[PDB]
């Protein structure tokens, strides 16, 4: 399948970017690891712009849409690293930063999705 290649290519690029940013930046602020945050915020931004852009361009090859969303954004973002980070903070007795991480990841990612959508809609 051609669709499978889109998922694997997009996914591999996103996964690689997440790996590089996380290893480079997570240890800088361990109470809310910024590499994991940045890739979730960035994936939120890209999926927002994709939301608006694909609406206006309905004849885009399903290959590029699949590579960008399921592939790149899907490989780039993570719910699992986010969760273990929170779980570790909970086990460490650091409730305030566990709660803060959940709010910043969720509220933040929704804001980035909104920004991406509304920036493109306002062009």
């Amino acid at each position: 399948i051609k669709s499978l290649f889109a998922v694997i290519i997009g996914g591999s690029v996103g996964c690689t970017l997440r790996w590089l940013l996380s290893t480079k930046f997570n240890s800088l602020f361990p109470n809310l690891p910024p590499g994991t945050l940045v890739v979730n915020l960035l994936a939120g931004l890209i999926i927002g712009t994709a939301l608006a852009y694909f609406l206006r361009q309905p004849h885009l090859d399903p290959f590029w849409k699949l590579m960008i969303t399921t592939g790149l954004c899907g490989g780039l973002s993570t719910f699992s690293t986010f969760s273990v980070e929170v779980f570790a903070l909970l086990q460490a007795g650091n409730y305030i930063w566990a709660l803060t991480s959940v709010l910043v990841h969720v509220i933040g990612s929704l804001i980035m999705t909104a920004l991406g959508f509304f920036i493109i809609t306002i062009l």
Binding site: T23, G35, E85, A88, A92
Partner: protein, 96 residues
């Protein structure tokens, strides 16, 4: 890149049979600290207990008066690359 080993391990108060120790946390998510202690002066069994990650002090009790003890602390900590793993220890000597 970032050390997971505590720093400035020291005895902050003492009685003949107990030691209050303290250290500075390393800049990582520590789930718990493992404290070890044993007589510095031969094969004598080293004992250990854990302290929660939010604490940076611990009491060691039931020691013998006038005896040299070797005391160590290491962490069980979360990090991105290694998930849950153990740091190297930091060590001091103190005579009750």
């Amino acid at each position: 890149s970032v050390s997971s080993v505590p720093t400035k391990l020291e005895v902050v108060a003492a009685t003949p049979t107990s030691l209050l120790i303290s250290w500075d946390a390393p800049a990582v998510t520590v789930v718990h600290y493992v404290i070890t202690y044993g007589e510095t002066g031969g094969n004598s069994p080293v004992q250990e207990f854990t302290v929660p990650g939010s604490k940076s002090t611990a009491t060691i009790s039931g020691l013998k008066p006038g005896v040299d003890y070797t005391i160590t602390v290491y962490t069980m900590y979360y990090s991105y690359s290694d998930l849950y793993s153990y740091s190297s220890p930091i060590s001091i000597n103190y005579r009750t």
